[PDB]
Ligand binder design. Structure first.
Ligand SMILES: COC1=C(OC)C(=O)C(C/C=C(\C)CC/C=C(/C)CC/C=C(/C)CC/C=C(\C)CC/C=C(/C)CC/C=C(\C)CC/C=C(\C)CC/C=C(\C)CC/C=C(/C)CCC=C(C)C)=C(C)C1=O
Ligand SMILES: CCCCCCCCCCCCCCCCCC(=O)OC[C@H](COP(=O)([O-])OCC[N+](C)(C)C)OC(=O)CCCCCCCCCCCCCCCCC
Ligand SMILES: CCCCCCCCCCCCCCCCCC(=O)OC[C@H](COP(=O)([O-])OCC[N+](C)(C)C)OC(=O)CCCCCCCCCCCCCCCCC
Ligand code: SF4
Lengths: 83, 155, 318, 99, 175, 96, 98, 70, 252, 115
């Protein structure tokens, strides 16, 4: 209680650089897990098509895959536009 | 004929030397403090291209500032002997010029000339800063009247 | 006309370095109540010419206790690396679009040790042999901090393409995002160029000069040219890295003017710092970075690598 | 390996990189992905001292894809004969070979 | 003709190595290594290895810096050796020059040099591969995969560097 | 500010890429024809080259597999002009 | 196998000779030793860039990181024989005899 | 009297000024008024090579639109 | 063993060989003699295990003039300027010391105005000499600006020195039996203006040096001198006052 | 070509400067100039003796940190990966190991410049 607070105060006075570094570091690990946008960053990275989306051979009974690149169905990234 | 070109070229060279002489400080006594006053704001040696600070390897002029004792003499000799050409040595102060107050001492040489060639004799005890500065200007005019390549061409 | 562009890069940098030797003697003097050089031409404009001519026609003394090979090679390395390290700079259109320009230039920045060591040892003097190791330790121990600072800053840029750095800043000055980092970076820059607060190699009481002791005239002036070219080059690096500017592609001159103004301001800050501060001690000099700078730099790098992930704001790779 | 903990306790530790037909970053195939796929799927559950002879033609096709020893030697022979007869001067390369 | 540069980059690599290994003064071996590394950075670079070339540039021109750092500290003496001091070093150097010269002369005549393995003297420009890269450098992306697929590699390395600083502590501790 | 600007830059990159995917098929369709043109030109020319040599089976494939491989760039830019091969290999590396 | 492979392999062979055939210096020998790994580093990067071995692109730096560590201790050992013995000249390096 | 420094850096500014437009203008001079087409990836290099081939003058920065085709 | 095995001495039982020739050395440094960072003349033959200095050995005599031999050939009136040229940053203080000795021998006291002029100009000398010490110290440490900023004021002091005696440095002013001659008219007013203006630059120097991080760090708590060990060593002046002994000849 | 042309231009330019520097001026070439220098004296019998030192440890920990700096260099490319979570944890491991090596260097004297 008192000892911990006094030690924090002394560190903030004796080696201020050490406490600043330790603090900002300790944040650096625990925020990314807590933050609700890292999944959105994963979505950012998966969104970028570095290579060609090679099509699939059509044979019937794939309603999920759009027939045309202008078709409504299929993966969409309107969240990317709003972001 | 060749005098025109060689004179213009060597005039350029001696001007460049004249406006960029670099003192090798070397203050031994109160003459050092007066020289330091001469580099102070008021007179501002550094304005004329003189730089005051200079290692003995990169320097053009030695100011023998103060009394030169017997124990000092070998050190001053080794300093000047290492000084690159051109090397004009100015002696400031009655003590360095010859003898001084302590002329008839037992461990003080009776003049920097007996140790090292002196190019400009600056008198004063101490020579008031502007008198030193005037000696520097006299050395500058001496560098102006320099005919190295003329004598080479007319050897 | 490529070689013409090269020459238009070297030669103006040479005049810039030349007149830096005048602007420093004027700025310092005015900072300490001295008028500065104003006798050689108007306002001392011609003074750098005279000293350059003197040093060219000053006798270059051969160090008798030396192997001339390194006594000649070290100025070559120091000067040539300093100039070729200007090659990939983002002027509105950088001369050489090297995909790893920042890493390219950081790697070449480490090469100044390869002039310092040969100068300090080949000249074969006590001051030289001391100052060689001391300055080498300085610059190598600050190169690491330069490296992590560069990486942490770049983690928000996107890549090592140094032309896209402008595209990174565009809206806001990058210092607004990494002012704690830049404050270290700038200072480490001050350390790497061996300037009065952090020089430690001159030390005109116990090292006198450190590396440029026995060097005289021309090879001696070449190391000054390297030193006062690294000033401009690293101040320009910091200028683009943190002090961004506008660049309209239809008007390239605008970014050029803004960038040169930033470089001049930063160099004036260099002269400003040196004209005031005392000089570090080797003990404190390495205490400053090992004990204090490095942990903060590590923590800041951790912060600046975690930050783009949590904000879902990773910079574009291409 | 001597004590293969990798497949016993069930994880890859180094097998991801061992060969170049594995899942490369962003599907960047190797130079000889087809040949080494052929070789690997040829020699699977067969035994090294038995598979080295059945999967031979695949193996040297793989090695020639890696090094191009035979193909570059063929090119060297072609260049040799071309320069020889050009120096001794019979025909001229067609304009596609000049510009 | 700057065609053969991709060849000569290796060639200056060889004879800068021999003098580096000619057992001269330690700094002259260092100079040989320095020119060898500088010319080998071009060898990796013109093959497309921009990042790896600049990487070896940086780390290696720091690494020879530190091996210098003790050469003037724990390796100098009253009379440092010179690249012309010992007589045998010249013989080592010239034996360095004539071997690969004879072999390349053969590879220029027969193109089937029999030394050790099988080699062809028909330059190096052939062995490159046609293709593309889209909008990503293969080398950079591969070295970036260290933090996604290099699961074990970074772990074992970082552990080794920690153990390395520990042993560097302990051996030089001086009781 | 950097968060929003970097999101916009990601938007620009996906747009530029989408252009790249849009135009990739045409570049592929010109490239295979161009490479096959080099191969056929080299084959016809080398056929005349190899008539005199007693043992050189024309157009042979060193590979036992019948599957087509990407031409090794050597036979691509073979007897071609030295500048053509110099560009084809070291242009990207040498370009600034 | 083109001439670049010959050159770096041949450079490694003479590095083997130079380090292993000691002349009189320990520091220069470990210098030859670290040049050895430079030759191997270049050699390794060659095939890896050549064959589009995308993963193996990280092997050189990995190969690098350990190798300097060796030199990191090598020269570190060099000082420890040096302060007592005086030099790195390995001909006094004889105390351990029997 | 700080303005005495103003000439001193002014030429200095000009000294750093020249590398700015000189590289900027020459690029614009060389590439038909367009700025240099930076090729940071092999796709850019392939585009530049196809532009050079299509130009027919071995000059990539020469560009022809639909008027060149049917 | 056959033959050469004879020259194969058994190893010791500790497994440590008898420590070889003593290489312990501290690499003597001469640290001079020109070395203009000593006011120009000095020699320090230093013995150091690298950094921590083990044992120094200053060599004074590098500016040796036979002044103490020179005095007993001139009269006291002729002997006065030696003291002026003796400690050339505190001229009038040395002249005060010598003159006070002389007319202490003579059982003579200077007139009161002579005493007041003496103390006023001795204090101006004190200002000059302290400016010397602090500014040149900052120059050694690295600070260049406080040198010139206070040296302009030192020149202003030199103007007063010139206006009273006749030379800006070596006054020969304070003679036995009172000062040589009266001050010029208007000198007091100029002294008044300078004194008004001086504190605003004294504090200005303070702010640059006092609270600065690196001025303190290079200087704070380096080379402590014990108060007891200070006075036995013959230390005096601020050297004593720095340690803590309340002693000052001006008061006691 | 281009880049190599710039490197060639710079090295030749530098060599012309050093050639004019070392050849143009004239020297009388007298013996006593060769005497070496130390603040007025010569460096007695030193300036090549083995340098009994202590900051060797700082010099070597430089290199040991430089390897890890090389290891963490690929980060800007690495941040462009699909599995960002693993990259985050493992890069954080690398910087934590940096800090731990520095801390062990710290408490166990180490980076403390030896006396
Ligand atoms: C009482 O106690 C005391 C002490 O202790 C106890 C002391 O200690 C001291 C000692 C203190 C001092 C000496 C104080 C010095 C004070 C001064 C006012 C003098 C110094 C003044 C300055 C403004 C400082 C200047 C120093 C700087 C900036 C840096 C210092 C460090 C260096 C390494 C510099 C050393 C000098 C060098 C290198 C020489 C300079 C060379 C050049 C400028 C070369 C220029 C070349 C060119 C321009 C080339 C290009 C030319 C052209 C024409 C371009 C075009 C050409 C083409 C080919 C294109 C004292 C006095 C003291 O009282
Ligand atoms: C860019 C710079 C352009 C100008 C270059 C000027 C070079 C001047 C060199 C130094 C001075 C010597 C000189 O001018 O000629 C050498 C000549 C050489 O012949 P000298 O006989 O006159 O030399 C003086 C006498 N001895 C030989 C004994 C030293 O010397 C002089 O001019 C000095 C008189
Ligand atoms: C080839 C070898 C040489 C290579 C170097 C370049 C060519 C030689 C130097 C040319 C210029 C200097 C010539 C000598 C000048 C001289 O001695 O005095 C000059 C003098 C300086 O006069 P001053 O003030 O020294 O005069 C003496 C003053 N008192 C008496 C108080 C000591 O000025 C002039 O002659 C007027 C013209 C000067 C230059 C005009 C342009 C200035 C602005 C642009 C500067 C930058 C671009 C250049
Ligand atoms: S001449 Fe006068 S001021 Fe100069 S040193 Fe001698 S006594 Fe002192």
């Amino acid at each position: 209680a008192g000892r911990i607070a006094s030690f924090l105060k002394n560190a903030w006075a004796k080696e201020p650089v050490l406490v600043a570094s330790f603090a900002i570091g300790g944040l650096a690990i625990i925020l990314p897990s807590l933050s609700p946008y890292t999944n959105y960053a994963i979505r950012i990275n998966r969104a970028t098509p570095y290579n060609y989306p090679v099509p699939l051979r059509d044979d019937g009974n794939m309603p999920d895959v759009p027939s045309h690149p202008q078709d409504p169905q299929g993966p969409s990234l309107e969240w990317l536009k709003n972001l | 004929r060749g005098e025109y070109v060689v004179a213009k070229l060597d005039d350029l060279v001696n001007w460049a030397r004249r406006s960029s002489l670099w003192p090798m400080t070397f203050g031994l006594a109160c003459c050092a403090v007066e020289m330091m006053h001469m580099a102070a704001p008021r007179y501002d040696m550094d304005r004329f291209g003189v730089v005051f600070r200079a290692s003995p390897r990169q320097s053009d002029v030695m100011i023998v500032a103060g009394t030169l004792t017997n124990k000092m003499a070998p050190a001053l000799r080794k300093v000047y002997d290492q000084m690159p050409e051109p090397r004009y040595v100015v002696s400031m102060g009655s003590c360095a010029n010859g003898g001084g107050y302590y002329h008839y001492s037992y461990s003080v040489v009776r003049g920097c000339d007996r140790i090292v060639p002196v190019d400009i004799y600056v008198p004063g005890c101490p020579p008031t800063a502007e008198a030193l500065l005037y000696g520097i200007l006299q050395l500058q005019r001496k560098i102006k009247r320099e005919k190295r390549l003329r004598i080479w061409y007319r050897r | 006309m490529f070689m013409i562009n090269i020459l238009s890069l070297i030669i103006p940098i040479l005049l810039a370095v030349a007149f830096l030797t005048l602007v420093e003697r004027k700025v310092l003097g005015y900072m300490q109540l001295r008028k500065g050089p104003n006798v050689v031409g108007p306002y001392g404009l011609l003074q750098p010419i005279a000293d350059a001519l003197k040093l060219v026609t000053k006798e270059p003394l051969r160090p008798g206790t030396s192997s001339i090979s390194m006594f000649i090679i070290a100025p070559i390395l120091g000067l040539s690396l300093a100039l070729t390290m200007w090659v990939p700079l983002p002027m509105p259109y950088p001369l050489i679009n090297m995909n790893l320009g920042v890493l390219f230039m950081l790697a070449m920045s480490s090469l100044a040790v390869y002039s310092i060591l040969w100068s300090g040892w080949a000249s074969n003097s006590k001051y030289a042999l001391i100052g060689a190791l001391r300055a080498v330790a300085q610059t190598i121990s600050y190169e690491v901090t330069l490296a992590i600072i560069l990486l942490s800053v770049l983690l928000m840029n996107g890549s090592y393409t140094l032309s896209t750095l402008i595209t990174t800043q565009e809206h806001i000055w990058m210092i607004f995002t990494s002012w704690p980092l830049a404050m270290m970076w700038f200072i480490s820059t001050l350390a790497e160029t061996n300037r009065a607060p952090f020089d430690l190699t001159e030390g005109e009481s116990e090292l006198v000069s450190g590396f440029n002791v026995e060097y005289a005239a021309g090879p001696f002036a070449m190391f000054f040219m390297a030193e006062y070219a690294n000033i401009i080059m690293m101040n320009a690096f910091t200028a683009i890295l943190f002090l961004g500017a506008s660049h309209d592609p239809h008007t390239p001159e605008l970014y050029t003017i803004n960038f040169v103004l930033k470089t001049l301001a930063l160099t004036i800050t260099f002269l400003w710092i040196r004209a005031s501060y005392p000089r570090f001690r080797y003990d404190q000099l390495m205490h400053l970075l090992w004990k204090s700078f490095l942990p903060l730099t590590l923590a800041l790098c951790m912060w600046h690598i975690s930050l783009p992930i949590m904000t879902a704001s990773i910079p574009p790779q291409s | 390996p001597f004590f293969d903990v990798q497949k016993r306790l069930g994880l890859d530790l180094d097998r991801w990189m061992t060969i170049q037909s594995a899942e490369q970053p962003h599907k960047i195939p190797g130079r000889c992905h087809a040949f080494e796929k052929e070789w690997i799927e040829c020699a699977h559950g067969i035994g090294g001292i038995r598979a080295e002879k059945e999967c031979k033609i695949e193996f040297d096709d793989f090695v020639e894809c890696l090094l191009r020893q035979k193909t570059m030697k063929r090119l060297s022979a072609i260049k040799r004969q071309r320069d020889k007869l050009i120096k001794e001067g019979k025909y001229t390369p067609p304009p596609h070979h000049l510009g | 003709m700057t065609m053969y540069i991709a060849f000569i980059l290796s060639t200056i690599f060889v004879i800068g190595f021999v003098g580096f290994s000619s057992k001269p003064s330690p700094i002259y071996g260092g100079l040989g290594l320095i020119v060898s590394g500088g010319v080998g950075c071009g060898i990796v670079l013109n093959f497309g290895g921009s990042f790896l070339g600049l990487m070896v540039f940086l780390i290696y021109l720091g690494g020879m810096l530190v091996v210098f750092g003790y050469t003037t500290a724990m390796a100098t003496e009253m009379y440092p050796e010179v690249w012309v001091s010992n007589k045998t070093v010249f013989g080592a150097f010239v034996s360095g020059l004539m071997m690969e010269f004879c072999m390349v002369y053969y590879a220029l005549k027969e193109e089937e040099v029999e030394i050790i393995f099988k080699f062809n003297g028909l330059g190096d420009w052939v062995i490159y591969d046609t293709g593309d890269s889209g909008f990503f450098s293969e080398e950079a992306m591969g070295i970036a995969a260290l933090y996604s697929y290099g699961t074990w590699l970074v772990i074992v390395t970082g552990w080794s560097l920690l153990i390395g600083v520990v042993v560097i502590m302990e051996i030089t501790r001086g009781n | 500010s950097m968060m929003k600007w970097n999101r916009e830059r990601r938007r620009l990159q996906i747009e530029d890429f989408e252009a790249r995917i849009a135009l990739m098929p045409l570049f592929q369709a010109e490239k295979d024809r161009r490479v096959l043109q080099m191969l056929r030109e080299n084959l016809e020319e080398e056929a005349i080259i190899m008539k005199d040599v007693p043992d050189w089976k024309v157009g042979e494939s060193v590979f036992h597999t019948t599957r087509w491989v990407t031409p090794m760039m050597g036979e691509l830019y073979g007897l071609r002009t030295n500048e053509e091969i110099l560009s084809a290999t070291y242009g990207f590396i040498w370009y600034t | 196998m083109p001439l670049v492979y010959m050159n770096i392999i041949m450079a490694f062979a003479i590095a083997l000779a130079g380090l292993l055939m000691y002349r009189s210096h320990l520091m220069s020998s470990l210098l030859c030793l670290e040049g050895m790994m430079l030759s191997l580093f270049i050699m390794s990067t060659l095939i890896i860039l050549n064959t589009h071995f995308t993963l193996a692109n990280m092997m050189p730096i990995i190969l690098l990181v350990f190798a300097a560590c060796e030199a990191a201790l090598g020269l570190s050992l060099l000082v420890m024989v040096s302060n007592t013995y005086g030099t790195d000249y390995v001909q006094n390096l004889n105390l351990l005899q029997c | 009297m700080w303005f005495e420094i103003l000439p001193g850096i002014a030429v200095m500014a000009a000294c750093l000024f020249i590398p700015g437009m000189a590289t900027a203008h020459i690029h614009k001079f060389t590439n038909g008024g367009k700025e240099k087409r930076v090729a940071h990836f092999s796709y850019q290099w392939n585009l530049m090579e196809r532009d050079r081939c299509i130009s027919g003058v071995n000059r990539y920065h020469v560009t022809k639109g639909l008027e060149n085709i049917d | 063993p056959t033959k050469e095995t004879a020259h194969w001495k058994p190893p010791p039982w500790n497994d440590v060989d008898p420590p070889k020739d003593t290489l312990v050395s501290n690499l003597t440094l001469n640290f001079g003699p020109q070395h203009p960072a000593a006011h120009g003349v000095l020699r320090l033959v230093m013995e150091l295990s690298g950094e921590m200095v083990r044992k120094c050995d200053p060599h004074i005599g590098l500016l040796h003039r036979g002044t103490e031999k020179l005095i007993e050939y001139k009269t006291y009136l002729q002997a006065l300027p030696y003291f002026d040229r003796l400690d050339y940053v505190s001229m009038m203080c040395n002249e005060q010391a010598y003159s006070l000795a002389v007319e202490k021998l003579l059982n003579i006291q200077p007139p009161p105005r002579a005493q007041w002029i003496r103390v006023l100009f001795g204090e101006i000398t004190r200002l000059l000499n302290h400016i010397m010490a602090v500014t040149t110290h900052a120059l050694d440490i690295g600070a260049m600006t406080p040198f010139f900023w206070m040296f302009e004021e030192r020149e202003k002091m030199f103007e007063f020195y010139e206006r009273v005696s006749g030379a800006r440095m070596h006054a020969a002013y304070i003679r036995p039996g009172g000062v040589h001659q009266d001050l010029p008219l208007g000198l007091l007013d100029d002294i008044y203006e300078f004194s008004k203006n001086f504190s605003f630059r004294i504090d200005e120097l303070e702010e640059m040096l006092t609270n600065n991080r690196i001025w303190r760090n290079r200087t704070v708590d380096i080379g402590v001198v014990t108060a007891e060990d200070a006075l036995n060593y013959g230390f005096s002046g601020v050297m004593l006052r720095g340690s803590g002994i309340q002693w000052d000849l001006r008061k006691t | 070509m281009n880049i190599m042309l710039t490197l060639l231009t710079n090295v030749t330019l530098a060599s012309l400067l050093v050639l004019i520097a070392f050849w143009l001026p004239q020297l009388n070439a007298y013996s006593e100039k060769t005497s070496p220098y130390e603040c007025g004296f010569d460096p007695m019998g030193s300036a090549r003796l083995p340098f009994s030192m202590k900051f060797f440890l700082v010099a070597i920990t430089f290199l040991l940190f430089d390897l890890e700096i090389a290891l963490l260099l690929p980060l800007p490319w690495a941040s462009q990966t699909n599995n960002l979570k693993t990259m985050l944890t493992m890069a954080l491991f690398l910087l934590i190991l940096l800090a731990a090596s520095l801390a062990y260097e710290w408490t166990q004297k180490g980076l403390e410049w030896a006396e």
